[model samples]
Target: MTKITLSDLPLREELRGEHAYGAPQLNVDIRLNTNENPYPPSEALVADLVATVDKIATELNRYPERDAVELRDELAAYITKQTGVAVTRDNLWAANGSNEILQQLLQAFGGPGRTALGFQPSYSMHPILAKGTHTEFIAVSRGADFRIDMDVALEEIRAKQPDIVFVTTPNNPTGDVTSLDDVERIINVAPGIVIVDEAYAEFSPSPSATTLLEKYPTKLVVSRTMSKAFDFAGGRLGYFVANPAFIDAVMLVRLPYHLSALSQAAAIVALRHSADTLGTVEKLSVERVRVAARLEELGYAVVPSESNFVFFGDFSDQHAAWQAFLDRGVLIRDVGIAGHLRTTIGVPEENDAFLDAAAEIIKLNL
Candidate 1:
């Protein structure tokens, strides 16, 4: 067996020193690092998934429906009902996750000689995906509050004229939402397409970016996930709502049979029970408020969040603070920020556990 190291390979020059993206999957009592829905699929959903798989098992020998028409149809129906936008399958495209959907968009719209712009302290994956697609990622720093600074945003967009712009509303790590009006302003100024990453939209009260798709047919794409609010992270179904033309663009780069029959069927079943799955969101939101308020009372400055997590801190050494929480058997995300960490809202007992940790960590003054 020949021995080779990653450094020994003739890797892409730009990717040579970059690390893979992920959070610490630590073994801890209260796991709240990743912003995932803590709820599990209902028994009915599981039973339906089992039945659906049984029905589709014989067809496993054949490739799944290449275009995933039925899954897309189900997604479309869910989106229309959830967002109050009357859209059809023509306006939707599905992939393994929002990450893959973003990658496909970059493959078609971004590459060498093109650029994608994003606001920093946002979803970390945006830049990584851009780089993977051989596109230059330009990051503009967010406001002091961890929200997008519209002035800096518009200025950067105008100056860069990037081929693609990423807006992660109800943003990851921070959980603050970028408003639709600001999004429209960005779309108006962007030289090319804008991808509104709404992976956590159901956790927020803000309107969907899909509502603006009609006006910016050529310039807007709303990328969403069943991962966060839909409790379908394990199911791995994410999609985008855009003008059919944008869908056509991605089709040029999407791998054939991209979604398996099992994935499509499971997603369809999840969508069938969307109401029950999403009801957990209401419970989570209430917990988010309680957690944020408790953290604030405990003397941490919490970034206002609309999503399923809270970003809070003022610790001099955030990593140590992160470690402190971990030491207490609570795992939260440091997000590489200097003074803050993020914790996903879990069930009531889990929230209480995190709050208990927060109380003690502050006393240690990490």
Candidate 2:
């Protein structure tokens, strides 16, 4: 029994060396590593959630709605109101998180010989999810400063005719958004589907791709997460908007009763009181701007940001900088983009700690 473990057992060949996706789950004084909405749910919202779940506690014996009918209705209404786009229950679908929604998409359209393409350093999970579904993954570079080279992107899509194309606006790790013009350009030319992962769309200054759904109904999908804007990561809800026919497609892959009763209950309450739950978005955006400017002032190369996090650095050894922050008990993301790192915006005090760590690192190194 010489340390026989997972390696000794049969695992999918592609999964042999892979670990599940996550940042280091370290306990620290100031954690700005994951691009999580750092605000806690308001006390009133929590009370309502507790009461709502309590009312349904006895319904535990029954399976939750297989369709999550009411949840989709509320989601559709929220998008309709927020985007001024008339979306209905038929145009929406949800799952545990955007990751699973993506998985279902891959299952529905991409497997075997088909491929999926995304820009590098966008979302780590996009490529991983592609591989997990036995779909071939193609990654193109976003060039320096990590914004899309639209020409190159179009070139790849035209050449590969990939079954799925991912465009993550206010893109993770890099923090730059894809312009609506660019999104439209892709949709006009793409042979298959174009998915706009709007995980951080709440912090963006631009309008949503949901607005384009009417024109590109058959080909466009705008994916969103309550995890970021709604302060609902713990609720495990991610959804997307598309044509009813598109919504009808993923139905083939979604597991029965995939969303649990408690999870749906929690998100419904959060959505019911969205004004209160989303109240801190403007404050967080303000902090994001302040922190990005502060990093640029400290002499680091900072990417222009429209999301809740900033990507910064030209560190010769980013790991050293990452460890430097952690040493000071302020955790940020190292993202493995040579010479660059990303840090999420946090509350005033936590951001102060992050700034202090940066200042000290700059002073010591420069």
Candidate 3:
């Protein structure tokens, strides 16, 4: 191997000390780190996927539908039914995953001189995407309850005048849902765009930010993904809902044929089978309640979650506590936050494994 290092390269000054974002992919008996659906898609879903592939295999010679109109059409329809908000293909956009969708938004609306604001302890990627786009990132702390503090948010917005503001409902790593009224307040006060990231929306009973789309067409975007509740993490598809104008903006920055035909075909098949696939969401939601309740009973402070995960702990050192679980063959996330850790709600057996670990770890006093 060459005796070179990352620091030896002529990297950008801003990127010099930055780390790539991801949770650990450790091989453990029970993993509850990434907020993914523990259930796998049914064989019937795969059968449909195979059928789709069989039909589209010959047409692979041509590029995917450049605009992905059919996929967007299906997505819009799904959103309309799921969120009770009527939308059309004109209001939707898709990319490799929600990450790419956010990146494209930053590219279109955020840049060197512009800034993006986010509530801290939210999705870690918001700031990362902002940094990648050379957009300055400003973090406003969340309330003690791990939800956004609207007062601080509005004050920050008025002070920073950011070009982009991100609100991750059922916020990652914490699983607390932001209220719709609070979302509207932030949007009303925000000087620029507000991105409501509903990556785990299907698991939550709360209203989706899409409900506010009609009122703030010029300043709101609601992003979602097939990764979490759809049990399609491996498929890598995500999308957003906004006004036709926002769709027009992302199109300006999107690469030609950015989505592959196979990806589009699979996502469409997944959507076609959404009724069956989404059945797992109810099970997960039930399990989420069970897991959170059990955590509290076990002496951990559990945050109320409307999503498929629980954020709990009052550990003196969260990493040490995280390692204790790992040592017992239960893998969870530390999330780099002091005194806190997050665990995805797995199946009953997997959850029992994590609970057992939690019980043992608690006694250790880490």
Candidate 4:
């Protein structure tokens, strides 16, 4: 690595104090950080993806599909199948990941004079994306339970009149979801786009905000990703459902041929075999419940989780507990939450490792 780092370079004015986005990528035996799906794509699906990419090798000389038409078409199909909402390729958009989708939205609708609002302790990327687009980000704090206070949220929307509002359902780190009724209230009062981030929708008991599409086509954007549910994190495919006009707007800011041919092919193959790949969701959901209950049993305050992870603690010094857990070869996220940390629900055996660590940590009373 270069000893002269980013600080040595003449970086942009806005990027002065900005750090890179990532979680600790250490080689731990049990990784519960980043909330990634622990499972890999099935063996048979991998073979098909290989064949699909091999077939596309001849076209490597050219750029990827400019619009990623076929991938978007399949994504649209998946959304329609799941929601009973009739969505054409015109109503969908895809990029490297949901972060790109949000970034493009910020570029199109949120810039120098615009503002974006997301509930506090949400996916940190929302504000980061806003900053990158030179957009103002207003952080609206959540209640003690980590769920949105509908009145406060609506009040902020009307008071700030943000150009874009982000609602991260089954929120990251906290793992609580936003209800559709609450979503409708925000969209009805908000001045601009409302992005409902359903990144963890598959594990939630509530339906997706895609149910709100017909009523507020112009104001609502429901985004999803293959990283969480489809067990295809390596593919880096994230997509959204919105009005055709929204799709048209993002087109103005998206990079040229952003999604590569290999990624598109992998996503397509994954979508086709979604049933098998997504089969782990039910088991994972069960693990989430068990893990949360076990944490509570161990005398730790556990936040109710509907995602693939559980947020638990009220530790005197969470970092000390984090290190203790790390010493046991199980890695969870510190998330900078003073008294809490988030742990992704992994396979049965991995969760057992985490539970065992929790048991020992609780006995120490730290």
Candidate 4 ranges beyond 4 A from true positions: 1-8
Where model 3 places Cα greater than 4 Å from the true spot, the runs are none
lDDT of 4 by residue, 1-366 (tens): 768977899889777876788887889989988778898778899899888888999999889889988988998888887777789899899988888888888899899999999999989889888988899999999997888988888888989999999999989879988778888998999898899999999887678898899899889999999999788777788898988998888888888888888888889999999878778899999998999999998899998989999988898999999999999999999888888988999999999999999999999877
Report the lDDT tens digits of candidate 2 across residue range 232-323.
88788999999999778988889999999998888888888888777788999999889988888888889999998999888888999899
lDDT of 3 at 324: 92
**In model 1, what are the clashing residue pairs, if there are any?**
none
Q: Per-residue alpha-carbon lDDT of model 3 for 242-361, expressed as tens digits? A: 999998898899999999999998999999989988998888888888888888898898889889888898999999999898999989988888899999999999998998888898
lDDT of model 2, residue 358: 97
C-alpha positional error of residue 214 in candidate 1 after TM-score superposition, expressed in Å: 1.0
lDDT for each residue of candidate 1 in 50-110, tens digit (9 for 90 to 100): 9989898998999888899988899999999999999999999999998899999999999
Error of 2 at 167 (Å): 0.2
Candidate 4 global TM-score: 0.97
Worst 10 residues of 4 by lDDT: 13-22
218 Cα displacement, candidate 4 (Å)? 1.3
Residue range with the least summed lDDT across 10 consecutive positions in model 3:
14-23
Candidate 3 lDDT at 250 equals: 89
Cα RMSD, each candidate: 1.1, 1.3, 1.2, 1.7
Q: Whole-model Cα lDDT per candidate?
A: 0.91, 0.89, 0.91, 0.89
